[PDB]
Amino acid sequence: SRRARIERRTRESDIVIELDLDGTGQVAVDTGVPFYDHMLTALGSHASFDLTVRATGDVEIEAHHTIEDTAIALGTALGQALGDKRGIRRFGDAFIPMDETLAHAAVDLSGRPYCVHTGEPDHLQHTTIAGSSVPYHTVINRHVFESLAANARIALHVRVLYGRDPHHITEAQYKAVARALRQAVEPDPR
Amino acid sequence: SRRARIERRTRESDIVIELDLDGTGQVAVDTGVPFYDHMLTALGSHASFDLTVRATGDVEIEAHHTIEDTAIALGTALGQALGDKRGIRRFGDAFIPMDETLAHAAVDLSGRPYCVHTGEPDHLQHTTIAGSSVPYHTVINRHVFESLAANARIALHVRVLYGRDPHHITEAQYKAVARALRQAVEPDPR
Amino acid sequence: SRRARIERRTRESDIVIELDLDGTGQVAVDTGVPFYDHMLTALGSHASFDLTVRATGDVEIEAHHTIEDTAIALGTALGQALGDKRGIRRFGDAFIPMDETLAHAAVDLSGRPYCVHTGEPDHLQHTTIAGSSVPYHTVINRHVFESLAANARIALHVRVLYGRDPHHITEAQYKAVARALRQAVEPDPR
Amino acid sequence: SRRARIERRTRESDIVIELDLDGTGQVAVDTGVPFYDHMLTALGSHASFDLTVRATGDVEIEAHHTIEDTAIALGTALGQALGDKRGIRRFGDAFIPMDETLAHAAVDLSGRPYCVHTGEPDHLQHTTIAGSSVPYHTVINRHVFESLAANARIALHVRVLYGRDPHHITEAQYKAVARALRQAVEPDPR
Amino acid sequence: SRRARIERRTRESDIVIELDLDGTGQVAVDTGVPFYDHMLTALGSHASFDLTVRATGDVEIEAHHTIEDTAIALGTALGQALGDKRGIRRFGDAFIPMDETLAHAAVDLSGRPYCVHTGEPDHLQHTTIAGSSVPYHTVINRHVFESLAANARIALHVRVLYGRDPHHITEAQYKAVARALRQAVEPDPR
Amino acid sequence: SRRARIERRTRESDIVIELDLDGTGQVAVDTGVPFYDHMLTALGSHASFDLTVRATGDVEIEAHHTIEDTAIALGTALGQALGDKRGIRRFGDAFIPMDETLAHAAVDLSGRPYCVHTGEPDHLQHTTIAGSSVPYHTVINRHVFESLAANARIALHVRVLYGRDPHHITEAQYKAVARALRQAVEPDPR
Ligand SMILES: [Mn+2]
Ligand SMILES: [Mn+2]
Ligand SMILES: [Mn+2]
Ligand SMILES: [Mn+2]
Ligand SMILES: [Mn+2]
Ligand SMILES: [Mn+2]
Ligand SMILES: [Mn+2]
Ligand SMILES: [Mn+2]
Ligand SMILES: [Mn+2]
Ligand SMILES: [Mn+2]
Ligand SMILES: [Mn+2]
Ligand SMILES: [Mn+2]
């Protein structure tokens, strides 16, 4: 019903997005950045979407360009899948507790592209989440949410109430956005 | 089912209110204060009420008296339309993002008349929203919410988390109250 | 018994005042400044005077001159109506609660022209109460009380204990002065 | 002439109130909370009312519910006994010195339900007045005055200027409210 | 009806006091301290007493002893003239504006001997009011009020809200006490 | 469907718990601590559970041990009644306004045992809620929530935004937890 397929070819990266809003959590994400894949899987699963992401980018330089472009394309796909935004709840928020972390996101679908991101500890501006592959810098979370809000043309407010672990803080923010989106896109029985 | 018609004649103003809780957003407000009309239209529409307001007051002096009396009558009408408050959710809250502003309202219908209003910037105590007609002073928002809570005999907590524009701050507060009321008045399937 | 009719013609404004101290609250005020009319009606009614005010002034410039001249003439009329001030209580004070505002005024009729005005919030020096007509600037309240005390040759002390709304603060100050005057002008049964 | 009988049955407590405004200090209070009985006796006696209070509540849990419900019913009874509030002074205040304590209360009967309570020392938020029976927590004084003002639909301002002993502070507040009410309900010879 | 004659002979001074509570302001005071005579005349006149004071003391040393003893005897006389304190208002307060000064006194006749004196500027602890005779030190005002309250066995609270001139501050305090006493000693028509 | 019966015998206390998640608010609690009974009744009723609690403990020493053990057993029962936690919403939050108090609780059922408790005033660490029986010390609220979260193996975040009365603060916290649990245990229609 509300589906979107977006292909975005640039110099930096080549992205393909497939999104269905009325899904069941069938998610398959591959971007070359493992932690970003983990986060997008959470975003897709907790929002009850159907999400397929195939991204190829210059991960030798760093993940910034791929992550940015993927977020832009995902935002575009979401905005297109919303369509006219007729007969939906249009307002959603969610608190996500993750151990010692509490995050909150509030969305307004009909509202104009705006993004406020507050509350993250100052040490998250130089934190890196690294494994066996391309690392993820937590200074990019604001960039990701801003890109998604700007390209979906929605109002997104993400707050971290408190939290210590950077993994938990990031994951909670993504889940909060996912659940706010899920609530906002539901049909309104009024 | 849950309807209320309130007529309030005083020296200062003459108010007529018609309210149905189980409505579809059919709103018609005329008070002689255009911005207050805008705000009441938002309140009625976002709460999914049926709201007709006809108010005549001494707008040559200022809008204070008309706005106060309208809020009192609207609160009375809401309280009467609730009736015994049997088999309703009784608890509602809503976050309303409006660009850079985030507002929150939480209600308790069965709770005794109480109103807490916090978070508004200090510059909103002397701000005026003015057009081609009778202006609206933002120092009256607290008065309006207090009057409505005191005459509906409900607990109303309105918070502004952050925000800059006075128009956005006011409009977000009214929408937050509307959506909290809407959630609180729904029948409880338990 | 204790009546006064004062006509004051100046370049700026033309004022006529009729005052009876032993009245019943028969008040008719017209100055071209609606909020000032409201305040003078409160002053006359809460002091149980008979008060007729007809004022014509240069309201195109601003209300300052008309308000100042009216206050001077009213003070003159009050002072003349007191006469010799023989066999009256001579001391009066009143607390006036108005919602969140608490004001207090204390008078000494036999005392020499003095006016102390304290307690008003700093934001009242640039606040405007505006409707559909000539606006009222709250920085003029001190001017009004000083003019009345200086021309009635009485001691007037007006205090605002606490308060937020400028309308309430102003109205409470006028009512406090009215009730203090009312108590002070009563005959002393001793 | 101005009498009221209020019976309020709830889950928590069962209250009966009998009040006459034009009384002579005939007071009989029994609530199961001895100190609250002492305070209500002072309230009734110093206001020159006729007051009969019979209250049964869950004092095994704590006195909060009984005290709250009694205050609500007393406020209702007072409001009903006032009636139309025609030809009364409508404004009353009283200073009550009690040893080292000075309290003040100011009322406005015609004014809308409002309660401001200021000045109490911070140590009164965790103070207990205890004897041989159910204790009295002084954090409930604000609750009591708010309940009475909210249910009588009057403006009540209670201030503690200074004071040390919690018994004296509480007793002075109750006496100040009683004397302010007494002055406010008198007929106005004007 | 309520009269008192007190003779107090000590080493330091010899005092005679004649007081009638139901008087008309017939005052004759002679203590050898002119300013103290002025203050006692104000106290007697503004309280509508009949007051005769004849005091002889060691004014060569200083006025302290004479002033103290006179205040003690006056307090004793007042306490005796009150008698059983049956059927009187028992509570009185008064604000006294005197130019730039505002003083307040509140009394409780039935209350136990207590005196609180607050608000006087710090420069009044070393100020002298001097003329052609024995000077008056303003550090004695607290002593005088304490002596009167302690010997009348009443509760006396005297506050100076604001003020600059020591003459005005002292005179306002005495007048405030006088008017509070006057109000408190009146019969209660209830 | 989702029921649990837990019997916990220790040296300190003997507890029996019966819990059904799909209930209608049929609550019967008896622990020997009246205020704790009140709080557990609120917890059971506002969560729409069926809750039977029979607790016998050493209330002669203090309520700590009984309250702690009851909370542990209740947490165990809840955790067992959840079972595999399959097909439930798994995330719930609730704002509870109670007069001047605003509390918030957010839960994550699948999340690992964690408890964050913030926002309570510092005076609640030495406050006692006492009636005619064993008193309740408010320093135990954190203990109770921690015990329940630790034994239910859920993530519980309880915040007090603002509040003055200790009774209201405690009651609001319990109701917030109840409503968050209620929302979290509902089946997910996705
Ligand atoms: Mn970038
Ligand atoms: Mn993870
Ligand atoms: Mn108002
Ligand atoms: Mn707008
Ligand atoms: Mn001027
Ligand atoms: Mn007005
Ligand atoms: Mn309560
Ligand atoms: Mn006592
Ligand atoms: Mn001495
Ligand atoms: Mn003098
Ligand atoms: Mn323990
Ligand atoms: Mn309770």
Short mmCIF file of N, CA, C and O and ligand atoms in Angstrom, two decimals, chain B residues 112, chain D residues 64-65 68 140 143 147, chain F residues 98-100 165 167-168 171, ligand 7:
data_model
loop_
_atom_site.label_atom_id
_atom_site.label_comp_id
_atom_site.label_asym_id
_atom_site.label_seq_id
_atom_site.Cartn_x
_atom_site.Cartn_y
_atom_site.Cartn_z
N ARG B 112 -8.47 16.32 41.27
CA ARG B 112 -9.12 17.54 41.73
C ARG B 112 -8.53 18.74 40.99
O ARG B 112 -7.39 18.67 40.54
N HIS D 64 -3.95 11.84 56.10
CA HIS D 64 -4.03 12.61 54.87
C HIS D 64 -5.44 12.59 54.27
O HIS D 64 -5.99 13.65 53.97
N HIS D 65 -6.01 11.40 54.06
CA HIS D 65 -7.26 11.30 53.33
C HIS D 65 -8.39 11.95 54.12
O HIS D 65 -9.21 12.67 53.55
N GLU D 68 -7.93 15.81 54.12
CA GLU D 68 -8.23 16.34 52.79
C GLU D 68 -9.74 16.38 52.57
O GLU D 68 -10.26 17.41 52.13
N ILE D 140 0.77 19.15 55.26
CA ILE D 140 -0.61 19.08 54.81
C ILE D 140 -1.32 20.43 54.93
O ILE D 140 -2.47 20.53 54.52
N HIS D 143 -2.16 21.85 51.61
CA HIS D 143 -3.20 21.03 51.03
C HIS D 143 -4.56 21.46 51.57
O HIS D 143 -5.52 21.58 50.82
N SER D 147 -7.51 23.13 49.38
CA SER D 147 -8.77 22.42 49.26
C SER D 147 -9.94 23.32 49.65
O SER D 147 -10.95 23.38 48.95
N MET F 98 -0.47 14.08 40.09
CA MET F 98 -1.21 13.99 41.34
C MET F 98 -1.09 15.31 42.09
O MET F 98 -0.14 15.52 42.84
N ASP F 99 -2.06 16.21 41.87
CA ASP F 99 -2.01 17.57 42.38
C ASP F 99 -0.74 18.26 41.88
O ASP F 99 -0.55 18.40 40.67
N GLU F 100 0.14 18.66 42.81
CA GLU F 100 1.33 19.41 42.45
C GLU F 100 2.46 18.48 42.00
O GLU F 100 3.53 18.96 41.65
N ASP F 165 4.40 17.10 48.43
CA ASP F 165 3.82 16.21 49.42
C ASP F 165 4.40 14.81 49.28
O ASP F 165 4.36 14.24 48.19
N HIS F 167 3.25 11.88 50.43
CA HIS F 167 2.17 10.96 50.10
C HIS F 167 1.91 10.98 48.60
O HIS F 167 1.85 9.93 47.97
N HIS F 168 1.77 12.19 48.03
CA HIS F 168 1.50 12.34 46.61
C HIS F 168 2.66 11.81 45.77
O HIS F 168 2.44 11.15 44.76
N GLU F 171 2.62 7.92 45.94
CA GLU F 171 1.45 7.36 45.29
C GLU F 171 1.57 7.52 43.77
O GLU F 171 1.21 6.61 43.02
MN MN G 7 -4.05 14.73 48.83
#
